[PDB]
Amino acid sequence: WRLEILELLKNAAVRAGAQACFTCTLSEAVPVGEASWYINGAAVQPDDSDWTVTADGSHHALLLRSAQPHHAGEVTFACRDAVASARLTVLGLPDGLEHHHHHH
Numbered sequence: 323w324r325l326e327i328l329e330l331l332k333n334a335a336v337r338a339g340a341q342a343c344f345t346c347t348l349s350e351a352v353p354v355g356e357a358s359w360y361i362n363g364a365a366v367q368p369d370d371s372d373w374t375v376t377a378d379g380s381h382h383a384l385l386l387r388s389a390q391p392h393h394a395g396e397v398t399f400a401c402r403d404a405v406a407s408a409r410l411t412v413l414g415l416p417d418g419l420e421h422h423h424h425h426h
Contacts, residue, residue, distance in 0.1 A: 325350035325402045332397070332408040337418060342386030342410070344397070351379045352401050359384050361410055363395030386410075 326349045336342050359375050359382070360366060366373045372393060375384050382401075386393060391414030399406040 323349075325404075327404045330406050332406065334397075334408065335411050335413065336386060336389035336393075337413040338389060338391070340389050340412075342384075342389065344384045344408075346382045346399065346401075346404065346406065348380045348382075348401070348404060350402060352377070352382075357382060357399075357401045359399055361393075361395045361397050364393060 328347045328349065330346045331344055334342050334344065354377065357377065361373070364372070366375055372387055372390075373384065374387070376382070389412045391412055394411050397406075397408035397410045
């Protein structure tokens, strides 16, 4: 019956074509106004195309479609005594090599 913050997903890096997963499972549902979801460098308008925000009960879900070298910025969220932060960054260097061979 309380409003204790259970778990928050922070710290996220998204390369080109990747996706972002930010959610905050609370103990109480908050309407629209006491909850603030924004990343410095790109305010999410009700019609935001790159970012998507929703609120259903005690669960707040926010994502990032295909990350592009420009969405980089800080991550700050606040609610019912629910303080949060993070660091969002996108890689634009195709210097990231990956192993395409699972096994040999």
